[model samples]
Target chain A: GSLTYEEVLQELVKHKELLRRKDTHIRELEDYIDNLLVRVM
Target chain B: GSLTYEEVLQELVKHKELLRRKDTHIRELEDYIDNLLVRVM
Candidate 1:
């Protein structure tokens, strides 16, 4: 139980730095998608 | 695995709304810490 969600939370807390990096990566992807749409349209 | 997947991104975005509700909770804890520091110092 604790090892499930709390473990997930611990993972989040531990790799918060990585998660931020991941967020940035996703933002870049989303921006790319937006730009591609703009270029296609 | 390669980083935060779309699922984690979606979960974070969803849970962030819950975190927003806990903004006051964090602030309250912040105030408690500040007061405790004041008292201890």
Candidate 2:
């Protein structure tokens, strides 16, 4: 079911926050993997 | 700026598609990292 603009705004904010965190988490892991790959080679 | 209900529906669908693809992307990265980590250890 579709939601109102107000409801959509609410959900959008949640996605923004969650997306921010997911990137931070993913980047940290990516950093480690790049470093680990170097060590392996 | 706020949108009308129809506009909101359009935006919401974009978010849904974007979120679903992001999940698939993240999960693929996660799987690779998990396997690579085991190889490193």
Candidate 3:
């Protein structure tokens, strides 16, 4: 379990990095979707 | 932008904690899936 926790922590760091990268992309996608909806209305 | 980074970091910590808890549940779910596949085979 101790080793597993360490591994999970390492993975968490990687996940955070991915999240950092994708957060901008996610926001952009959401904005795009909202704009499309607005146009449809 | 600076404040956003601080908020992201806080969210990252919460995500890590949630991931830690879900890790066990995920493993169990995966194991169950594997067992079902094996039984099906």
Candidate 4:
């Protein structure tokens, strides 16, 4: 059977959360990169 | 009603792909950081 609209929207919310987590990780990586650059002489 | 098992597992694949994308970007940043370190000396 095809997915219902409610079902699709529910999963869409889940997908949003996944993207939110990736965004957070990218921020952490950016901070680490900054630290690496700062430590250089 | 709560999410069905199929519904939950379906989003798992989507979440995995999002995480995979993050990993790829992280690799790119790692390369960039490597170049910065190399040029620092």
Candidate 5:
């Protein structure tokens, strides 16, 4: 069955929060990757 | 030596665009990871 509007909104909110935090997590990973590249250079 | 204002701005702009793309990439990766977990369960 298709999601209702409320269900979709709830999922969207949950994913948006997860994504915001995930962005921070990925940025940290990128920083470490950049550090490694700098050392390699 | 420190970067000039223009150089700093340029790097910031470059990193911003890179981060924008990386965010999308990470979102796709996360979706794949979620799919894997669903299959595992």
Candidate 6:
């Protein structure tokens, strides 16, 4: 189980950096594809 | 059971990436974590 919300948040915060990096990477790829046509010109 | 549904869901969702990655064999640090998460939480 989660144990508790506070504990969950605490544990998650410890790995916040990792999660942030993961999301950032995904965003970068999405942006890259959205801007892909610019490079074709 | 004394476990709350939210608690179980929260714990499982916290490892979303890890759970997803468990199906792969990337062998990167992320994959290792994914495997571990699958085995644990």
True contacts kept of each: 0.00, 0.30, 0.00, 0.10, 0.00, 0.00
Model 3 chain B: ten consecutive residues of lowest lDDT:
B3-12
Weakest ten-residue segment in model 2 chain B by summed lDDT: B1-10
Cα error of candidate 3 at position A16, Å = 5.3
Q: For candidate 6, write residues B1-41 as lDDT tens digits.
A: 63654565566565776746754645566666776567754
Evaluated at residue B13, the lDDT of candidate 1 is 57
Model 6 chain B lDDT-worst window of ten? B2-11
Residue A29 shift from truth in candidate 6, angstroms: 7.4
- Which segments of model 4 are wrong by more than 4 Å? A1-5, A39-41, B1-41
How do the residues B1-41 of candidate 3 rate in per-residue lDDT, one tens digit apiece? 66554455665578878767777898878877887567764
Quick one: how many clashes does candidate 5 have?
A: 0
List DockQ for all candidates. 0.05, 0.28, 0.04, 0.11, 0.02, 0.06
Better model by TM-score, 3 or 4?
A: 4
> In the order shown, what is each candidate's alpha-carbon RMSD?
14.8, 8.1, 11.9, 9.5, 17.7, 11.4
Q: All candidates' lDDT scores?
A: 0.65, 0.77, 0.69, 0.75, 0.65, 0.65
* TM-scores for all predictions: 0.28, 0.47, 0.29, 0.36, 0.32, 0.29
Runs with alpha carbons beyond 4 Å of true place in candidate 3: A1-17, A20-41, B1-13, B39-41
Q: On residues A1-41, what C-alpha lDDT tens digit does candidate 5 reach at each position?
A: 45544444455456557768977998888877887667754
Q: Please, what are the lDDT tens digits per residue for candidate 3 over residues A1-41?
A: 56544455565578878767777898778877887577564
- Categorize the docking of model 5: incorrect
Q: Which portions of model 2 miss their true places by more than 4 Å?
A: A1-3, A29-41, B23-41
Consecutive 10-residue window with the lowest summed lDDT within model 4 chain A? A1-10
TM-score of the first chain in candidate 1 relative to the native first chain: 0.44
Q: Which candidate ranks first by TM-score, i.e. highest? A: 2
What is the fraction of true interface contacts found in candidate 3? 0.00
A19, model 6: CA deviation in Å? 3.1
Relative to the unseen true structure, what is the C-alpha lDDT of residue B15 in candidate 1, on a scale of 0 to 100? 60
Question: Of models 5 and 6, which has the larger TM-score?
Answer: 5
